[PDB]
Design an enzyme around this catalytic site. Structure first.
Site, PDB file in Angstrom:
ATOM      1  N   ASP A   1     -12.257   9.283  -3.044  1.00 30.28           N
ATOM      2  CA  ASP A   1     -11.680   9.597  -1.766  1.00 30.28           C
ATOM      3  C   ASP A   1     -12.778   9.565  -0.715  1.00 30.28           C
ATOM      4  O   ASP A   1     -13.713  10.368  -0.725  1.00 30.28           O
ATOM      5  CB  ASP A   1     -10.986  10.937  -1.842  1.00 30.28           C
ATOM      6  CG  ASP A   1      -9.963  11.126  -0.741  1.00 30.28           C
ATOM      7  OD1 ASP A   1      -9.289  10.169  -0.372  1.00 30.28           O
ATOM      8  OD2 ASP A   1      -9.899  12.241  -0.244  1.00 30.28           O
ATOM      9  N   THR A   2     -12.668   8.602   0.175  1.00 26.62           N
ATOM     10  CA  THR A   2     -13.479   8.592   1.383  1.00 26.62           C
ATOM     11  C   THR A   2     -12.829   9.426   2.484  1.00 26.62           C
ATOM     12  O   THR A   2     -11.599   9.550   2.586  1.00 26.62           O
ATOM     13  CB  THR A   2     -13.686   7.160   1.903  1.00 26.62           C
ATOM     14  OG1 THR A   2     -12.444   6.461   1.993  1.00 26.62           O
ATOM     15  CG2 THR A   2     -14.615   6.404   1.013  1.00 26.62           C
TER      16      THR A   2
ATOM     17  N   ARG B   1       0.168  -0.213  -2.678  1.00 23.36           N
ATOM     18  CA  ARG B   1      -1.250  -0.587  -2.722  1.00 23.36           C
ATOM     19  C   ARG B   1      -1.703  -0.835  -4.132  1.00 23.36           C
ATOM     20  O   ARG B   1      -1.368  -0.065  -5.017  1.00 23.36           O
ATOM     21  CB  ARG B   1      -2.154   0.507  -2.132  1.00 23.36           C
ATOM     22  CG  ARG B   1      -1.870   0.848  -0.692  1.00 23.36           C
ATOM     23  CD  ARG B   1      -2.736   1.962  -0.132  1.00 23.36           C
ATOM     24  NE  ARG B   1      -2.589   3.175  -0.911  1.00 23.36           N
ATOM     25  CZ  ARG B   1      -3.143   4.328  -0.576  1.00 23.36           C
ATOM     26  NH1 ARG B   1      -3.856   4.465   0.560  1.00 23.36           N
ATOM     27  NH2 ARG B   1      -3.111   5.307  -1.433  1.00 23.36           N
TER      28      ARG B   1
ATOM     29  N   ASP C   1     -12.019   3.401   1.684  1.00 19.78           N
ATOM     30  CA  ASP C   1     -11.457   3.214   0.337  1.00 19.78           C
ATOM     31  C   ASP C   1     -10.251   2.291   0.228  1.00 19.78           C
ATOM     32  O   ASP C   1      -9.592   2.296  -0.812  1.00 19.78           O
ATOM     33  CB  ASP C   1     -11.144   4.602  -0.368  1.00 19.78           C
ATOM     34  CG  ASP C   1     -10.228   5.440   0.399  1.00 19.78           C
ATOM     35  OD1 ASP C   1      -9.432   4.913   1.227  1.00 19.78           O
ATOM     36  OD2 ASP C   1     -10.235   6.638   0.053  1.00 19.78           O
TER      37      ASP C   1
ATOM     38  N   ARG D   1      -6.422   0.002  -2.872  1.00 20.34           N
ATOM     39  CA  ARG D   1      -6.963   1.328  -2.809  1.00 20.34           C
ATOM     40  C   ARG D   1      -7.901   1.555  -4.014  1.00 20.34           C
ATOM     41  O   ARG D   1      -7.524   1.335  -5.156  1.00 20.34           O
ATOM     42  CB  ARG D   1      -5.785   2.301  -2.844  1.00 20.34           C
ATOM     43  CG  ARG D   1      -6.174   3.789  -2.919  1.00 20.34           C
ATOM     44  CD  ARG D   1      -6.921   4.280  -1.704  1.00 20.34           C
ATOM     45  NE  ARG D   1      -7.001   5.746  -1.548  1.00 20.34           N
ATOM     46  CZ  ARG D   1      -7.910   6.499  -2.194  1.00 20.34           C
ATOM     47  NH1 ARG D   1      -8.809   5.913  -2.981  1.00 20.34           N
ATOM     48  NH2 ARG D   1      -7.965   7.819  -2.022  1.00 20.34           N
TER      49      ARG D   1
ATOM     50  N   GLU E   1     -11.141   9.971   5.941  1.00 16.13           N
ATOM     51  CA  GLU E   1     -10.418   9.123   6.928  1.00 16.13           C
ATOM     52  C   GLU E   1     -11.311   8.826   8.165  1.00 16.13           C
ATOM     53  O   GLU E   1     -12.286   9.532   8.402  1.00 16.13           O
ATOM     54  CB  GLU E   1      -9.152   9.882   7.368  1.00 16.13           C
ATOM     55  CG  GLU E   1      -8.113  10.021   6.254  1.00 16.13           C
ATOM     56  CD  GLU E   1      -7.364   8.708   6.072  1.00 16.13           C
ATOM     57  OE1 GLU E   1      -6.903   8.145   7.089  1.00 16.13           O
ATOM     58  OE2 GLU E   1      -7.299   8.212   4.957  1.00 16.13           O
TER      59      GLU E   1
HETATM   60  C1  LIG Z   1      -6.290   6.748  -5.497  1.00 17.32           C
HETATM   61  C2  LIG Z   1      -4.800   6.939  -5.749  1.00 17.32           C
HETATM   62  C3  LIG Z   1      -3.981   7.438  -4.722  1.00 17.32           C
HETATM   63  N1  LIG Z   1      -2.659   7.638  -4.930  1.00 17.32           N
HETATM   64  C4  LIG Z   1      -1.750   8.220  -3.925  1.00 17.32           C
HETATM   65  C5  LIG Z   1      -1.724   9.741  -4.106  1.00 17.32           C
HETATM   66  C6  LIG Z   1      -1.683  10.286  -2.686  1.00 17.32           C
HETATM   67  O1  LIG Z   1      -0.292  10.575  -2.339  1.00 17.32           O
HETATM   68  P1  LIG Z   1       0.006  11.290  -0.941  1.00 17.32           P
HETATM   69  O2  LIG Z   1      -0.098  10.237   0.127  1.00 17.32           O
HETATM   70  O3  LIG Z   1       1.396  11.696  -1.238  1.00 17.32           O
HETATM   71  O4  LIG Z   1      -0.965  12.415  -0.725  1.00 17.32           O
HETATM   72  C7  LIG Z   1      -2.305   9.166  -1.842  1.00 17.32           C
HETATM   73  C8  LIG Z   1      -3.759   9.333  -1.439  1.00 17.32           C
HETATM   74  O5  LIG Z   1      -4.263   8.122  -0.858  1.00 17.32           O
HETATM   75  P2  LIG Z   1      -5.246   8.213   0.397  1.00 17.32           P
HETATM   76  O6  LIG Z   1      -6.430   9.065  -0.087  1.00 17.32           O
HETATM   77  O7  LIG Z   1      -5.563   6.769   0.639  1.00 17.32           O
HETATM   78  O8  LIG Z   1      -4.443   8.861   1.470  1.00 17.32           O
HETATM   79  O9  LIG Z   1      -2.203   7.989  -2.596  1.00 17.32           O
HETATM   80  C9  LIG Z   1      -2.128   7.353  -6.204  1.00 17.32           C
HETATM   81  O10 LIG Z   1      -0.921   7.554  -6.415  1.00 17.32           O
HETATM   82  N2  LIG Z   1      -2.860   6.828  -7.200  1.00 17.32           N
HETATM   83  C10 LIG Z   1      -4.183   6.657  -7.068  1.00 17.32           C
HETATM   84  O11 LIG Z   1      -4.796   6.217  -8.067  1.00 17.32           O
HETATM   85 CA   LIG Z   2      -9.043   8.535   1.940  1.00 16.33          CA
END
Ligand SMILES: Cc1cn([C@H]2C[C@H](OP(=O)(O)O)[C@@H](COP(=O)(O)O)O2)c(=O)[nH]c1=O
Ligand SMILES: [Ca+2]
Length: 129
Positions: free
Chosen positions: A34-35, A75, A15, A29, A37
């Site tokens: 959510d993919t 991102r 993702d 991103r 890891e």
């Molecule tokens: C997809 C997405 C993720 N995020 C943030 C929330 C999550 O915070 P935390 O890292 O604090 O959990 C994290 C999840 O991304 P990943 O799934 O790539 O880890 O990225 C956003 O803020 N907005 C979004 O639209």
């Molecule tokens: Ca992920």
């Protein structure tokens, strides 16, 4: 919402991807998904699926939603398309991503994705088997 150009710089995982956008390298991103890891189950397959989708594409486009364009990690948050096909949708439809991270105001394609997820679960694909 509208599509804007970008070119592959490099694969990251299911993702996230490094693209050149308005001539600058950015990590993107994928909205609303959510993919797993890499180190989790179906993580390698998700990363391979997205990597392949971007390598094979003649044209990559990014489409921002109405809300935030960058997350707290810097991102870019977008819908990304490979030769007209939405990555975010394609991952969910294959059971390689869940719908997730649905924040108000950046959720234009939510129901499209939820329709794809329902069809993936029905078929018990990948994460839903
Ligand atoms: C997809 C997405 C993720 N995020 C943030 C929330 C999550 O915070 P935390 O890292 O604090 O959990 C994290 C999840 O991304 P990943 O799934 O790539 O880890 O990225 C956003 O803020 N907005 C979004 O639209
Ligand atoms: Ca992920």
């Amino acid at each position: 919402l509208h599509k804007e150009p970008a070119t592959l710089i490099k694969a990251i995982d299911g993702d996230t991807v490094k693209l050149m956008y308005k001539g600058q390298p950015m990590t993107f991103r994928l909205l609303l998904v959510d993919t797993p890891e890499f180190n989790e189950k179906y993580g390698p397959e998700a990363s391979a699926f997205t990597k392949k989708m971007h390598e094979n594409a003649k044209k990559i486009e990014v489409e921002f939603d109405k809300g935030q364009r960058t997350d707290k990690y810097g991102r870019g948050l977008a819908y990304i398309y490979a030769d007209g096909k939405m990555d975010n949708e394609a991952l969910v439809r294959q059971g390689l991503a869940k719908v997730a991270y649905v924040y108000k105001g950046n959720n234009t394609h939510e129901q499209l994705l939820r329709k794809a997820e329902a069809q993936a679960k029905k078929e018990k694909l990948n994460i839903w088997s």
